Symmetry: D2
Subunit: 251 residues, 4 copies
């Protein structure tokens, strides 16, 4: 019987690439999304056309609130409801925007969205994943290769991603006895933002030593599939940079 994976924010871009590559490898998938309903359903349609009854969608806001634990518990539940098991969790969903320290959304909302999606939701999903559990169980957290050389005015986002590194490490430690491995993949510049202009995209491209280009979504996904695979059976607590050398380059 085929294993199953939850991928958060899987409707587009890197999350979709991850869900697609897991599915190609044999997995049944829960494609979680927040606002991108059409794209999520369109992906599940494609995957199910390849293998019937192997993809479902699951909608949730991963902003921090007092109900976030329930929402995270329900995402995991949806995987057991559809597929009878949950082998893999990939924490990919993420809010990303500037939050300058010195002077739209209130700061309360900024905290809730940036820390919720990048850190607290991954924590709650990890709790729920673990509580529901031979086989090959693991979690992969999408981290950021540039956490120690952050973008200017992205403190909350950066705090969130640092917290995600602590979760990766703390959860690797605590869940090791249950056979659940916990690891990360840390992109540098991969698929650039949709709203970014081509000139600014090129400025970022020229900073990458290996090939002067951004990582493809498939390149990020490749690292994810390695860590979930049997070829990574002794690996836990590890974060693999997939950044083409970007984090090595001084100002």
């Amino acid at each position: 019987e085929a294993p199953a994976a939850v991928v958060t924010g899987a409707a587009k871009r890197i999350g979709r690439a991850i869900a697609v590559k897991l599915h190609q490898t044999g997995y049944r998938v829960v494609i979680h999304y927040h606002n991108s309903a059409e794209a999520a359903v369109s992906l599940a349609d494609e995957l199910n056309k390849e293998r019937s009854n192997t993809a479902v969608v699951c909608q949730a806001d991963l902003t921090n609130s007092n109900v976030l634990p329930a929402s995270c518990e329900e995402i995991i539940n949806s995987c057991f409801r559809a597929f009878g098991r949950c082998d893999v969790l990939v924490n990919n969903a993420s809010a990303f925007y500037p939050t300058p320290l010195v002077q739209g959304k209130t700061v309360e909302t900024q905290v809730a969205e940036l820390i919720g999606t990048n850190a607290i939701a991954p924590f709650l999903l990890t709790m729920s994943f673990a509580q529901r559990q031979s086989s090959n169980l693991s979690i992969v957290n999408l981290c950021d290769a540039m956490v120690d050389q952050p973008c200017m005015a992205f403190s909350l986002y950066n705090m969130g991603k640092h917290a995600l590194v602590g979760l990766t490490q703390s959860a690797a430690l605590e869940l090791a006895p249950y056979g659940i491995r916990v690891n990360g993949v840390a992109p540098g510049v991969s698929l650039l933002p949709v709203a970014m202009g081509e000139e600014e995209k090129d400025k970022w491209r020229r900073k990458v030593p290996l090939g002067r280009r951004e990582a493809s979504a498939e390149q990020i996904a490749d690292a994810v599939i390695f860590l979930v695979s049997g070829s990574a059976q002794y690996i836990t607590g590890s974060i693999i940079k997939v950044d083409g050398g970007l984090s090595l380059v001084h100002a």
Copy 2:
């Protein structure tokens, strides 16, 4: 006249030591506290008896919530209302207890542990910076053991990791204003009052330098250095004060 500092969680233990040492250096201080009202007020008395009009208290819960931004703004304000300036911020207040992955609801655990260790420091940093030769700086109390965390302390460790990110991000962003941002990372210091000596001693034996915990004063020494004129080029730095504990393999 004399510079002013806010120290969060300053009524006892390390925060008290820090407040006292800053006061001894010539600072006026805002003693923030949450539940330890008697100790805070008694500390303010002692400091004011030493030098008049150099200490006040400010109570606040630093648990994350929709009112935390206001609370943090008011802590910073209390320094300007009392002293007319705010030169140093020390983010010391911290919740610490296990939150296993398998009485408090989990959402309360999140709020307390991520609030006190990370979000409150961010919000105080915002308010500090907005309200601004001078020697302005922030010192965050981090943890030397963040990469080898205590078992079942996920949320606490996430909080201290986020604090490292804030230290770096704020160092970068506030550098144009001359505000330095740094950390001090204890290993074992003091030990919990509720811990029995037998368990205390197991920890002491782990420390290479002396087989003892740090005194609060030793932690405070590092904070004093970072706020001083002898650290004017230092920002984004985290100084371990751990007697080598983080270097010791399992």
Copy 3:
């Protein structure tokens, strides 16, 4: 036609498993060795029996000395002599023993520990680069415990740190030629051959993931990944393969 790889210290244990998996994946291999001539020869014989003339041996001392650059150049030359190309370099050979601060001379200890773990990797990297659809890469066998080192292993640990520096510096510098440079960092793998099981168990008990040492094959799996087409954007990265060992506090 088939790509080719140099694996240093490939006659036994982890380096042997690396060479075997590389060969299994389709590479022709240079099995470098120092003392273990029978095992190296026997391995090349095994691999050549599988596929004709897909393995050769190359002996060299990788201790630092005035002849080390020439020896390293000749290792790379041996790959081109045998196979007409050199796609992959795996710096695996390593001396490992204590060098307390307080019957080899210290200058010999320096030469062996720093030479095998760092200088030879550098010299091999130079020679590999100078000699250059294409998937060119280097993988350095680092150490997950480099920041929590064994007591009295300062020169070894210095070597392994220098090897991290080389991994990063070379990733940057060689990126414009399409040569990727990465590492794999074991925690405990295999354990020493003569170590009593009761001592082995003390180490095993420390590993969170399964309370056991890694197999040689599990380390090799990571190397295969880094050399593969699935890692073609990965450079300057060091993958721990340690079962969580480096996360465990004292």
Copy 4:
């Protein structure tokens, strides 16, 4: 009576500032140098004119060789010969130049860059510890804040400074039971090379978040003085960046 310190490469620049501040603090000092004899002697004259019999010079090449252990032992011995004790060792001397991967031989590059930056510090540390067989004994290694974002084509120099981090950690661990603390100070840009032109200096200056300028030698020295002081008695294995935020800056 007055404690004594050895500062390597102390005739000029940062090592000179260190020696001076140690002396202003009450230490007697061994001014080690290699080629800068006139400067070393001039500094010893200035210090002794301030307080007679409190400075000596000591010449040694710290290039790696089979006699490097003897040279390092003699440096420490010279402090004991002059002053009867050796309380502080500051490993400051350092060769620095490019060694690309693709007039000096490579064996000479290796010996100089790895010798000065790493092996000599190890040997000096050994000899310091062994001679210790009322006091605040410690070692301070001059590291580099940019070791993880290294200058292009500086691999041997970078390998040296990384080994120096490992030494700092390994020796802190091993020497702790003897009451000897071992720490580091990690500049980013300080002073700038004497060779460097005004335009190129300003280019580097502009990179620094805190003040858009290089650190003074005295600013580096301040941190060294802190680490040797009674205010750092629980600090060992710590490396303090003194870089004005430079290492936080992405490409």
